[PDB]
Design a protein around this ligand. Sequence first.
Ligand SMILES: Nc1ncnc2c1ncn2[C@@H]1O[C@H](COP(=O)(O)OP(=O)(O)OP(=O)(O)O)[C@@H](O)[C@H]1O
Ligand SMILES: Nc1ncnc2c1ncn2[C@@H]1O[C@H](COP(=O)(O)OP(=O)(O)OP(=O)(O)O)[C@@H](O)[C@H]1O
Ligand SMILES: Nc1ncnc2c1ncn2[C@@H]1O[C@H](COP(=O)(O)O)[C@@H](O)[C@H]1O
Ligand SMILES: Nc1ncnc2c1ncn2[C@@H]1O[C@H](COP(=O)(O)O)[C@@H](O)[C@H]1O
Ligand SMILES: [Mg+2]
Ligand SMILES: [Mg+2]
Lengths: 271, 271
Amino acid sequence: SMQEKIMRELHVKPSIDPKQEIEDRVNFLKQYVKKTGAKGFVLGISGGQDSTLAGRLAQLAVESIREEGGDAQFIAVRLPHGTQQDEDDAQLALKFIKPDKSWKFDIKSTVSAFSDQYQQETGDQLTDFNKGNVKARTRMIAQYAIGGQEGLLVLGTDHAAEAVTGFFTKYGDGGADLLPLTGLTKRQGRTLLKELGAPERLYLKEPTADLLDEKPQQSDETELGISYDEIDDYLEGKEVSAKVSEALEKRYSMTEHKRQVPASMFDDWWK
Amino acid sequence: SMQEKIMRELHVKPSIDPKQEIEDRVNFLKQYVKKTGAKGFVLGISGGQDSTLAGRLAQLAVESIREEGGDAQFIAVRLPHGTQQDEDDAQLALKFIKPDKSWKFDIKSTVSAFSDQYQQETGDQLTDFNKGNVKARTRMIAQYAIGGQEGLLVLGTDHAAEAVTGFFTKYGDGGADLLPLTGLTKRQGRTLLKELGAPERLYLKEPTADLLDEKPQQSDETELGISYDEIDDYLEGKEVSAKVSEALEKRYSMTEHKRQVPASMFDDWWK
Ligand SMILES: Nc1ncnc2c1ncn2[C@@H]1O[C@H](COP(=O)(O)OP(=O)(O)OP(=O)(O)O)[C@@H](O)[C@H]1O
Ligand SMILES: Nc1ncnc2c1ncn2[C@@H]1O[C@H](COP(=O)(O)OP(=O)(O)OP(=O)(O)O)[C@@H](O)[C@H]1O
Ligand SMILES: Nc1ncnc2c1ncn2[C@@H]1O[C@H](COP(=O)(O)O)[C@@H](O)[C@H]1O
Ligand SMILES: Nc1ncnc2c1ncn2[C@@H]1O[C@H](COP(=O)(O)O)[C@@H](O)[C@H]1O
Ligand SMILES: [Mg+2]
Ligand SMILES: [Mg+2]
């Protein structure tokens, strides 16, 4: 089945044991860092569900490593573009995560400079959509810079519900070293957050990429036109409307390039 | 055999037919663009060998596309960080490539704006090494912005002699849509340029990533500690000294991460 194939490719489980998922995902983080000899992790904290979940798992992983007499640290970093409208949630996220270090890097001046030079060289203004993708790539650079200066791995927040739709920026939030949330559906992620003792405000929060200047904090589902719950039912193998399965299936193939290393002539996935 | 496994993973032919290689690679470019319905390609033209070769292939593919009655175009772009020391070679490359459009985007103001914020936020100054990586990722953003504005795909110039040593910036120049030079060694590449009639200056100069301010135009061979000729003999399946094989193989395993999508607990390669 196409749905069965996707489920298997994305590593989704129809049902999970939240306590055990948390243990294994924290152990993955611990084992990876130790194998590489890295000094910890860095992650951009948005105030959204996924980063809040991934950020707490990272914090639990570095605490465990030190308990074992190792040395590891977690740097949480806010990356607003000027004034973030839901900064309050970010601040709440931080209180809940309790990271070893909380940094900040406002990306407005870089993005501005980039924009101004674009129009000056080409005579065109960047569209809102293209500017939104510049913002997402700038956050990548910012995280890689901190990671580079401090000897840390960059965590990525991709999970099955964002993966199936290719809903992330190529080499932007998609640019990361490791993925602790792989295989989890949106609802399964909320379950994990609930078991961790997270504030309800962080997991009943409407998912948003908030990249646009013309339409702040726009909802994922709006941009998508399918509900995350429909998405979760499909991935968890529940039966859904054919109108649902076909639109999901089509977007998945169309976004395969985001899930693979750059194409060459020796690759067949694209043919 | 380790050498033999690398050769196969990297797609290297111990022996090639240059005219056939040219045809295959120009056809892959035409095949991809038709499948995806993209309008053409964009690529950064450095004045070094690799970008000169890829740029010429690209130009040939779009001219061939337009001959069969299709529509496709090629934008060649200069990405100097202020004044590029070998700008003269880059101008010579454009003259050989003969692209449909040649644009320019100076990344210096974006890089300075970034470095300045870094220091304002962290109180630290970027190392020359880390700043060099910001230049590379900024060039990626520039190309993806032009591609986004115009509807084009981003070509990347990675080839086997760069892949084997992980000599490219992750999500910097490693960030692209498709790779026309995959499997070619440095010398095989020179052979293709000789077949296409390129100016000798373009493949006689020393390869350099030129990302550093403190040590501009530093040659790869200096950074690497091995020459491109020892690298090519290894890749080509020739019996090299124990000292080349050791160094190469050590370097390859340490950079595997640059050659896979981000690691998850479900991947085995990292264990
Ligand atoms: N089939 C393809 N193969 C390889 N690269 C592709 C393909 N289709 C598009 N691309 C590249 O990917 C970019 C789009 O990816 P990006 O991460 O920006 O998603 P987005 O534009 O934010 O949203 P959308 O999901 O609507 O594409 C394009 O501008 C192009 O460079
Ligand atoms: N084993 C690993 N797994 C995943 N990511 C890693 C691993 N080792 C390093 N990294 C990440 O890769 C980055 C290094 O890649 P990058 O392109 O920046 O290379 P570089 O430092 O310019 O050159 P080199 O890596 O050859 O010294 C590090 O900042 C870190 O975030
Ligand atoms: N304003 C922000 N501040 C910090 N990190 C951010 C910000 N926006 C996005 N991120 C990062 O980008 C990832 C993807 O966001 P999203 O598109 O909402 O799924 C988040 O999980 C964060 O790690
Ligand atoms: N000064 C530059 N101008 C334009 N493109 C460049 C520049 N430097 C690097 N690039 C691009 O980056 C790729 C990698 O360069 P290199 O590290 O020299 O192998 C090149 O093949 C170009 O496509
Ligand atoms: Mg998210
Ligand atoms: Mg090169």
